[PDB]
Ligand binder design. Sequence first.
Ligand SMILES: Cc1ccc(-c2nc3ccccc3c(=O)[nH]2)cc1
Ligand SMILES: [Zn+2]
Length: 208
Amino acid sequence: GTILIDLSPDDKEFQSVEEEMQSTVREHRDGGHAGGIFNRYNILKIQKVCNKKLWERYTHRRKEVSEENHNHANERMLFHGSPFVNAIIHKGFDERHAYIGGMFGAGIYFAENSSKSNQYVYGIGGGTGCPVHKDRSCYICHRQLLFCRVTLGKSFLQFSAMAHSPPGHHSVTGRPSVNGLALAEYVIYRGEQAYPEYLITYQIMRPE
Ligand SMILES: Cc1ccc(-c2nc3ccccc3c(=O)[nH]2)cc1
Ligand SMILES: [Zn+2]
């Protein structure tokens, strides 16, 4: 039931998504090992992901959360990188898409920094890099990320350097406590709490 609609680069919606992508790049403590070395991207395409059943699944859960949290879904737009991007856009997020070994337990992880999600496009730790060249810092091969609508509800705050949500909470927030430039990361434990709104196709760019 999924169709993908291309956005024009002249469309204000394309432009605002590209700006969130570019402006949330940061340097990583691995020196580029997992995601590659880059300061910016070449955006090749942005598509809207349209699936009525998957949208209604999201809004149903969003209302449940809202009603448990004084009419506040605490909805964010966050990045997700995964080897399962093609399954997610067709079938929706579920337990198969969780990071079993994540530091906040087995759940589905999202980032404010697009470059954090870029570290997972080719698997945990960048896996073995692109399929064609086996290069985690490949500047040629086309990558994909999702920019997702995510319901956090009442979020458990962890101050740091599928399972269940902590009792009385709908998500976990990983607050950075050492790297002053890192943005927050988030975990949900129910696939119904995220919708893959935009599929972004891009390359990382070699710094000059
Ligand atoms: C199988 C698998 C594992 C981890 C990710 C993943 N982990 C993250 C951890 C922190 C912040 C963002 C992400 C992310 O986008 N994907 C996706 C799929
Ligand atoms: Zn490659």
